[PDB]
Amino acid sequence: AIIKQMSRYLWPKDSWSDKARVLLALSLLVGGKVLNVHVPFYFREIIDRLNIDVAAVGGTVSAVAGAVIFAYGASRIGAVVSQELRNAVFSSVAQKAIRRVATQTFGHLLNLDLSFHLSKQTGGLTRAIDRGTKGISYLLTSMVFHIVPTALEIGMVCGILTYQFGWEFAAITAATMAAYTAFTITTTAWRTKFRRQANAADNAASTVAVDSLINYEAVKYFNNEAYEIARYDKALQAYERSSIKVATSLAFLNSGQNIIFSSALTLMMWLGARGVLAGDLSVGDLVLINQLVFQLSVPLNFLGSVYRELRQSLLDMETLFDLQKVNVTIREAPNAKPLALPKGGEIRFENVTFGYYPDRPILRNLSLTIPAGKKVAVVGPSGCGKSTLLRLLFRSYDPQQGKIFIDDQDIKSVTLESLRKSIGVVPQDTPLFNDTVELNIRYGNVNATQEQVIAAAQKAHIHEKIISWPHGYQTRVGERGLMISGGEKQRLAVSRLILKDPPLLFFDQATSALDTHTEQALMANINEVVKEKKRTALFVAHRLRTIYDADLIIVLKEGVVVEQGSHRELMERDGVYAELWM
Amino acid sequence: AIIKQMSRYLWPKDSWSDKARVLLALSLLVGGKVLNVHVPFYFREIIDRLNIDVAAVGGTVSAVAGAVIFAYGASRIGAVVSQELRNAVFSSVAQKAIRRVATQTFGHLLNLDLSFHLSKQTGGLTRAIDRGTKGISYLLTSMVFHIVPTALEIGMVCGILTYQFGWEFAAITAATMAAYTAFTITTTAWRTKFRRQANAADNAASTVAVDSLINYEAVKYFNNEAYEIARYDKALQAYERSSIKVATSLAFLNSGQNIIFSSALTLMMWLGARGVLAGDLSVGDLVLINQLVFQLSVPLNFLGSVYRELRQSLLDMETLFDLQKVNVTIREAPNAKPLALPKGGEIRFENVTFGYYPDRPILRNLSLTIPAGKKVAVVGPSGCGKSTLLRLLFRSYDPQQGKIFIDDQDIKSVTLESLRKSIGVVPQDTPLFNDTVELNIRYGNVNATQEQVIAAAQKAHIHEKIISWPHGYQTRVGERGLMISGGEKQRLAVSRLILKDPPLLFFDQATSALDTHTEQALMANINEVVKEKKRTALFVAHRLRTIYDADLIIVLKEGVVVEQGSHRELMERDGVYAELWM
Numbered sequence A, B: 001a002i003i004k005q006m007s008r009y010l011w012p013k014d015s016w017s018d019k020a021r022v023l024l025a026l027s028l029l030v031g032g033k034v035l036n037v038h039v040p041f042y043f044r045e046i047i048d049r050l051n052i053d054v055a056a057v058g059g060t061v062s063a064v065a066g067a068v069i070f071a072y073g074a075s076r077i078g079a080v081v082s083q084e085l086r087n088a089v090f091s092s093v094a095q096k097a098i099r100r101v102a103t104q105t106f107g108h109l110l111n112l113d114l115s116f117h118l119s120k121q122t123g124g125l126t127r128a129i130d131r132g133t134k135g136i137s138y139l140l141t142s143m144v145f146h147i148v149p150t151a152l153e154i155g156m157v158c159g160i161l162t163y164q165f166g167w168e169f170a171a172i173t174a175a176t177m178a179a180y181t182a183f184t185i186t187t188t189a190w191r192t193k194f195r196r197q198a199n200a201a202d203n204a205a206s207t208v209a210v211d212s213l214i215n216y217e218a219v220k221y222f223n224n225e226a227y228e229i230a231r232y233d234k235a236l237q238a239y240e241r242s243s244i245k246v247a248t249s250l251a252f253l254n255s256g257q258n259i260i261f262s263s264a265l266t267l268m269m270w271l272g273a274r275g276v277l278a279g280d281l282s283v284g285d286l287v288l289i290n291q292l293v294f295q296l297s298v299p300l301n302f303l304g305s306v307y308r309e310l311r312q313s314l315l316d317m318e319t320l321f322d323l324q325k326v327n328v329t330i331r332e333a334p335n336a337k338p339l340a341l342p343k344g345g346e347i348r349f350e351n352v353t354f355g356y357y358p359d360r361p362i363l364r365n366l367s368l369t370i371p372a373g374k375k376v377a378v379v380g381p382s383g384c385g386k387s388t389l390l391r392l393l394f395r396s397y398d399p400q401q402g403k404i405f406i407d408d409q410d411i412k413s414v415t416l417e418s419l420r421k422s423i424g425v426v427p428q429d430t431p432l433f434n435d436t437v438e439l440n441i442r443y444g445n446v447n448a449t450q451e452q453v454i455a456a457a458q459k460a461h462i463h464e465k466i467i468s469w470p471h472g473y474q475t476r477v478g479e480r481g482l483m484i485s486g487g488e489k490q491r492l493a494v495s496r497l498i499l500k501d502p503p504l505l506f507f508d509q510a511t512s513a514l515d516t517h518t519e520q521a522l523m524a525n526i527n528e529v530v531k532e533k534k535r536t537a538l539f540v541a542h543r544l545r546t547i548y549d550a551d552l553i554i555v556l557k558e559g560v561v562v563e564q565g566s567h568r569e570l571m572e573r574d575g576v577y578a579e580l581w582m
């Protein structure tokens, strides 16, 4: 638990305005605690300057004690304005560190690999980033607001009560802080289980209500309304049990804490009374002792809540620092070359064996050649493993056995960014960003003006359907935009492809939908935009009645390439429409 | 804003243990504030009993001031234990009121009508119940913890400072509380906009991350990782702007508040000094005045956060009290009769005209008769409005024109609960409760033992497939259970129907799925369980090649019944398989 504190003490520095305002935060911390401890001393002086017999000098308050009254006021005001200014100044440092850490972690995540991003749910990762960065924010914020200043003030109070009254009073206030902290830590560790129980069996009741209201037709059809009401009562009853235990334990915590300070303040009042009756102290030293220890009691009023959230931050920060050290599985070879990509695009597979979970090979000892400018298609049965082809050449994965060469160069030796620039993809299903259609089309090339977007809408016939949209192509689209049809989604994908202008083109199960006439329209569309555009293109389909009129055909059975040639040579195998029995 | 306070002051009462512990809460409130204000008076006595010249009696602390030292300790301890005990005691009252209000609102919601439950999203309604009841909890909790006790203590402090020192000191502390409350209310109203901005542009960044990580294949295929990182930077930058403004405004609030008390305490210190030098007061009366006003400053330290959440509670509580006064659209006639239901089940429609949005009639001037024990089906085109039939007879809706009679009695005159008991439904799609299959089957009859569930699994062949489930029929099923097939969902529905044992049976688009062989199996299954079980049954299908062999057939064109008779008379119209062109 101290290792994380070491790391996150070390990191926030190294800018100039950052270090300037953290110096200002520390300066206001120490000045605030000094002006805080000077309040009881000026209160002692006000008491002890008016404790003269009025048969003495008397006179105006300005002459007797006006300096120390104004100094009491100024010390109180300054001691809280310094607190609020150190908070306002260190919050800038905390927030900037949070922004740069969250950005670095997000970039790391996007640089990780598909096995990782299919292992774990994305909502979990983004909540990990969010809660880990709020945890780091609370660690810096807590260490500068609560943990350090009240420890500094405990030090100064045990020092002044030593310098003026002896080690009796320092011993009492140090034993008080030891007992108060032991008690508050133990009780708030015991109490957070009640807090999380009252949160768990509140989401329980909320989702019981959600389940009953989603299934409203069902609950009404079977006439058991009272059953749902009773189940909601039982869930809410568990909630009220846990909330009552939370409030009761909070009462126990607060009462025990102030029993510890009231025992401390009473014992120091007694020893101050012994000091006064023995003649050592004065009467004002009583309010000095009492107000010093009580002023310690103001920051430590939140010891139970800046330890619960501090430990929760050290739990979430650990998950974020677990994401920050995962891996890079597919890495490029050092000093990778962008070479051999501007050639006549040929992809040759050499004895390639790849499968998900290598104990079950899906693609087995495969070798092929895809020349330049050719509309080649690959066909096969369902689940044979054709879809890995793209995921193998885009170097989303690696070939466990065998090698891949684009125009006489191994993929493991080519620079990753230029490789993935050169490739262009139309996926089987294209998810759409919850944005404007202008930006979904623009996602092919971010630094593209509007006219390129318009042309991309033209070339695959999107412009008519975006004129048909309400706001033009400024329409907000997505899962929360307008519910659209899959054919227009692949039109968006091919518009992305047109804006990329890549050498290599892939259409990986681009026709996988229900009907045929929209499919044959989009097939035609991508044909006149892909052939007569002089780029090498690889279709992928298990529906070969769609791609029977392509240029070069290859077929894969059970992980091996079997037949390679034209349509008529394929005609001895399936390729007839005979699979349309249903 | 005061009307809600009137209502929720009025309601929590009327039980005996409830009123007992609210009496105990109020007793501890007043006792706590009394023991709180006695702390500065015992501190005055400790100061003023040791301010004697030590040339006087002197002696032990026990003789001089030991009673008042122990009384200072006891008053502090008691004044905080009474606070914590009034909180622990009034929390029971608050939670029980919340449970009964949330149950009443939930029962009200389930008693509302389908137009309402299709108008509004269910998540919105359940968050309305949740947040409205947390709002009522915070209103009772806040009014007993913060708003009332600190107003009582302000009253007692302005009363004691009047009784002992004059109206000068009461005027100063009342002007202090007026200025402190005006300032804190104005600043926390100005500051909550920053708080909600920092919450809105944090969900913005979180969903930007969610959108980028869901679309991971897409962002990797177009090589624009830096684009997503930059957009996450802009969202997080807006977050850091708003969080910096939140922390800065909190610093302003806290510093201004303690400027107001420090000006108050200094001005009262000055007038106490004038009183001491004039001989009126004593030196201990200075610590009396200072500690009284400062002890007021402890509860008012949360005035900015028990007003923000109090106003948010009066916003959510209003939405809940808007749900609590909606309507009952379809109500039963007063003294409705359960009569005419145990007859030979015949349903006659008389000149019935119903449509959604009555400016567009969907069903138009319809009259038919459904005798007892007959397997009758109704067919027609897509969207003609056949599905309203069930929703018309179950009295989910009302016939705008025309009347409905089951066995010579109008539906508007029959008791609703016995009506909906007598009806049994197999919906087109049956949602399944996120529970065990044992309870989804049990939902037909809640007070059914296991053997009835087993028999219901037998009669439609569910028992084999629940033996096939991992835990037997104890398997947890649902959206988060095991992903199942639709045919087994309708098997669950008909098992529900068997456990109901109703006279009337409806199968409203029960066959609406993709394939046919599972459909023909489930059609057969429901046939041998429905006919030869001597209950009148109404199938509903727009796929009449499935129901062509039923007993009685009726057909509806464009909202009017056209032909009624056997299968051969229907054969002159469609009913051939000729619609299977695709």
Ligand SMILES: N[C@@H](CCC(=O)N[C@@H](CS)C(=O)NCC(=O)O)C(=O)O
Pocket: A184, A250, A253, A254, A257, A300, A301, A302, A303, A304, A305
């Ligand atoms: N002073 C108490 C808690 C003070 C406190 O927690 N105040 C705010 C948060 S700063 C609160 O309401 N927390 C909820 C809780 O602790 O139950 C302690 O020693 O733990």
Ligand SMILES: N[C@@H](CCC(=O)N[C@@H](CS)C(=O)NCC(=O)O)C(=O)O
Pocket: B184, B250, B253, B254, B257, B300, B301, B302, B303, B304, B305
């Ligand atoms: N004393 C400050 C607020 C003290 C406070 O509210 N602390 C905690 C626990 S109740 C909190 O909720 N802070 C949230 C905030 O106000 O930003 C005021 O007068 O508003």
